Amino acid sequence: KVVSTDEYVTRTSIFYHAGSSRLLTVGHPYFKVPKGGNGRQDVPKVSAYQYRVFRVKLPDPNKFGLPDNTVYDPNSQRLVWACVGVEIGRGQPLGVGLSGHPLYNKLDDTENSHVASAVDTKDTRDNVSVDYKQTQLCIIGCVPAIGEHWTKGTASKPTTVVQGDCPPLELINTPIEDGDMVDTGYGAMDFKLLQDNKSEVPLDICQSICKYPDYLQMSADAYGDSMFFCLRREQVFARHFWNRSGTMGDQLPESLYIKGTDIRANPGSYLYSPSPSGSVVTSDSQLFNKPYWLHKAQGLNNGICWHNQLFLTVVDTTRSTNLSVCASTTSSIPNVYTPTSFKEYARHVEEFDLQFIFQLCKITLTTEVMSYIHNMNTTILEDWNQDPYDKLKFWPVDLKERFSADLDQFPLGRKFLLQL
């Protein structure tokens, strides 16, 4: 069986505040722009529609500064940090941004239209931009969050795959790393694998993977180490209805229509995919800059940071505005406007101030306890007396020296004392 942490983890009256005074990142909202030559000289991909996963390292409480005997006996007890309060600070103003692709596969407007039949022979595809689905989600854990997405699979029954035939779809669970693209309205799938077209979705996700947090997985998790706090708010509607150019792989059955004459001999394309849009960014529906207290977690783990690691996974598209930087090619400002004498750039911005309230805890290593902890993680006892997340990409947030005792001084700290 698996047992709650409230059983074998004794809490104390010790409280601490920690926070990265400010976090910032700047770059291109679509793709990584290299300038090479050579180190470093380049611009990273920073979009409002990608996961921000902060690996937040906490100081070893057993080796913590000013270690007194009055707190714990290190012959039967070890110390562990437990999360109680979190306030995710968003710095930038609320905005709405665009994502697009010059060669967006769009046959013709199938919503309400009239003018153009756009017969499928060339690519009557035009240039399309669009605002994605508004998504605000938050996840805290001692283990990186788990996501889901669809990827090319293989024959359920062993038949030779013909080139052009549709591949079967397999659902894959993957750790949500800093940088991974979120659900942008076009679904959660590998656009690099399932779209050889390279023209179905806007540039930012065109060759990336869209992951959605497998909430069903992280909750049904045994120990619940993955997530123990959760917040989500997503809205989306169909702005415009379109048709996909290309030859249909599935033949539209004659038993669903009466064949017309003219061009209506063989019916038009039936591949309909609409353009998504987040109705409106409002601060009423805002999900951050607010203090969130953690009493009871969903999982049997109750806010406990094993190995002193906290994993904050967050998505915020409410601040998705993009910046247009225009520099002239000539050093003197041209008296006449010529569009060729101006270099235009696309830059995006994301600001953060992470705040935390932890609670020091004692664990008396009774013999039945160690036989439980050992079966959970062999490493916890090992590091008490090789990291598996080395391969993964997180935003490092070192708080080993950001821990402050007196909560009076800090904004979240005061909010916590009031809460008591």
| Interface of this chain with a copy of itself, residues 97 to 156, rule: CB under 8 A | 97-103, 105, 108-117, 120-123, 126-131, 133, 148, 150
Can residue 285 be called a binding residue for a copy of itself (CB under 8 A)? yes
- The residue from 261, 375, 385, 386 that contacts a copy of itself (CB under 8 A) is 261
Nearer to a copy of itself, 60 or 234 (CB): 234
* 35 vs 391 by CB, closer to a copy of itself: 35
- Are residues 104 and 288 in contact, defined by beta-carbon separation less than 8 angstroms? no
420 binds a copy of itself (CB under 8 A): no
Enter the tokens of residue 321: 């505005």
Residues in the chain preceding a C-to-N separation beyond 2.5 angstroms (breaks): 385
- Stretch near a copy of itself under the rule CB under 8 A, chosen from 238-246, 303-311, 356-364, 389-397: 238-246
Interacting residue with a copy of itself among 14, 236, 370, 392 (CB under 8 A): 236
Only segment of 244-252, 309-317, 379-387, 390-398 that touches a copy of itself (CB under 8 A): 244-252
Dig out the tokens for 207 from the structure: 């060759």
Q: CA of 92: how far to CAs of 43, 179, 289, 319, 411, in Å?
A: 20, 19, 11, 7, 19
Residue 366 CB, shortest distance to a copy of itself, in Å, is 20
DSSP helix/strand/coil, 217: helix
Question: How many C-beta atoms surround the C-beta of residue 220 within 10 A?
Answer: 11
CA distance linking residue 367 with residue 374, whole number of Å: 11
Q: Which two tokens stand for residue 208?
A: 């990336």
The residue with tokens 């023209």 is 199
Residue 130 or 310 having the CB closest to a copy of itself: 130
Q: By C-beta, is 91 or 383 nearer to a copy of itself?
A: 91
Question: H helices of 29-188, where?
Answer: none
Contact call for residue 238 and a copy of itself (CB under 8 A): yes
Half-sphere exposure of 118 (CA within 13 A, CB side): 20
Options 15-23, 50-58, 301-309, 387-395: segment touching a copy of itself (CB under 8 A): 15-23
**Binding flag, residue 343, a copy of itself (CB under 8 A):** yes
Establish if 293 lies at the interface with a copy of itself (CB under 8 A): no
- Burial of 38 (C-beta count, 10 Å sphere; 0-12/13-18/19+): exposed
Peptide bond before residue 322 is cis, with ω within 30 degrees of 0: no
Interface residues for a copy of itself in 68-97 (CB under 8 A)?
89, 91-97
Residues numbered 151 to 180 that lie near a copy of itself (CB under 8 A) are 157, 159, 163-167, 169, 171
The single residue listed with the structure tokens 């290593």 is: 365
- 4 counts as binding a copy of itself under rule CB under 8 A: yes
Least Å from the CB of residue 398 to a copy of itself:
18
Between 66 and 333, name the residue whose CB sits nearer to a copy of itself: 333
Looking at 70, 256, 382, 385, which residue binds a copy of itself (CB under 8 A)? 256
> Which span (61-69, 72-80, 295-303, 392-400) binds a copy of itself, by CB under 8 A?
295-303
Structure-block tokens of residue 150: 């669809």
- Determine the 3-state secondary structure of 370 from DSSP: helix
Instruction: Note whether 249 binds a copy of itself by CB under 8 A.
Output: yes
Chain positions 368 to 407 lying near a copy of itself, rule: CB under 8 A, are 406
Residue in 6, 179, 233, 292 binding a copy of itself, rule: CB under 8 A = 233
Distance (Å, whole) CA 249 – CA 192: 19
Q: One symbol per residue from 310 to 339: x for binding a copy of itself (CB under 8 A), - otherwise; what is it?
A: -----------xxxxxxxxxxx-xxxxxxx
Q: Are 320 and 130 in contact (CB under 8 A)?
A: no
Pick 174 or 235: Cβ nearer a copy of itself: 235
Cβ of residue 347: shortest distance to a copy of itself, in angstroms?
A: 6
Retrieve residue 176's tokens: 């949500």
Q: Could you tell me which residues are beta bridge partners of residue 395? A: 54
The first and second tokens of residue 154, run together, are 């293989």
Enumerate residues 198-217 that contact a copy of itself by CB under 8 A: 198-200, 203, 206-207, 212, 214-216
DSSP reduced 3-state for 18 = strand
Number of residues that bind a copy of itself (CB under 8 A): 174
Reduced to 3 states (helix: H, G, I; strand: E, B; else coil), residue 355 is: strand
Residues whose CB is less than 8 angstroms from the CB of residue 396 and which lie 6 or more positions away in sequence, other chains included: 54, 55, 57
User: Among the candidate windows 39-47, 66-74, 78-86, 385-393, which touches a copy of itself by CB under 8 A?
Assistant: 39-47
